[PDB]
Amino acid sequence: FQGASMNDLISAAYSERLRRVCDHIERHLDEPLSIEALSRMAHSSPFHFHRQFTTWSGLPLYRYIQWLRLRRASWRLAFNPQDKVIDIALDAGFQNPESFTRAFKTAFGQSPRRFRQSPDWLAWHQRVPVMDVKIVEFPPTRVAMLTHLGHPDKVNASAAKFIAWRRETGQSPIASSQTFGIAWHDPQTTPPAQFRFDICGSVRQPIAENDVGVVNSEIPGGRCAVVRHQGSLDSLPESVWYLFREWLPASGETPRDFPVFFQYLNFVHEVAEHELLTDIYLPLR
């Protein structure tokens, strides 16, 4: 049908209700704005008014009022040069000119005084608007490591060997040193006959030689993507998949010739699985 639909008519009436409310706010700024009254003016519940305004305006009432006040102060900066900046900052509801300057630099992109000097209003009109992954330069670390080649489960057993070595040789990766796991392969995709996992601990000097199989090696430094994973060692492969799916296409950076490696800032069983902290590191060239 080409005709007007009852559904669209209702949505239009609702939107224009809330537009009436917006205009009332624009008029009655700098006033005690009782949410009960504004909620009544929208023919809606006081308990749901904020979510509706956030839904449609795109920003809550406190951000909206703040940013309208900031735009008013911007007009006053550019076109009322006689007014003092402290006075303007007080008029916009800010206690200190420093905090007003903070908010201006945060939302606008220019400092207040530079705006008073050369307003770039075009930018202002264009500036109306999950997991943190970072880029760090990992320093090359001499470590002592044991390589496991076999079934992915037996890895735990081999890890025990390393722990035993730490008690026996007096080498202390426990303190003033770090403990990493070089994850060469993904156990599901990779044949468990070739699965390689390196359990390593940081050392300040070489560890001589030992019959257990622990040997000296190094983790090279340079560009490297870091993602903070919170929880189980069984949960790490999914965040590794996250890194590969999301960071590699978007970043456009190229990985270098070293396997993925995790640094356990919180060791396994000393704290709970729910509070365990691991850092996944993707080598980047």
Author numbering: -5 to 123, 132 to 287
Give the published text.
RNA sequencing and proteomics data show that this novel mechanism protects Salmonella Typhimurium and Escherichia coli by increasing the copy number of STM3175 (YgiV), a transcription regulator with a GyrI-like small molecule binding domain that traps albicidin with high affinity. The protein binds albicidin with high affinity in an equimolar stoichiometry.
The DBD is connected to the C-terminal LBD via a short helical element and a short linker (approximately 10 aa), which was not resolved in the electron density. The dimensions of the groove (length approximately 30 Å, width approximately 10 Å, height approximately 12 Å) provide an ideal environment for accommodating compounds of linear architecture. Despite presenting as a monomer in analytical gel filtration, STM3175 forms domain-swapped dimers in the crystal, where the DBD of one polypeptide forms contacts with the LBD of a second molecule (Fig O(A-C) in S1 Text). In STM3175, the groove is mostly lined with hydrophobic residues and extends into a tunnel toward the C-terminus of the LBD. Attempts to crystallize the albicidin-STM3175 complex were unsuccessful, but molecular docking of albicidin to the crystal structure of STM3175 suggests a binding mode where albicidin is positioned in the central groove of the LBD. In the best-ranked models of the complex, the N-terminal half of albicidin occupies the binding domain groove, which is a well-described binding site for other ligands of GyrI-like proteins.
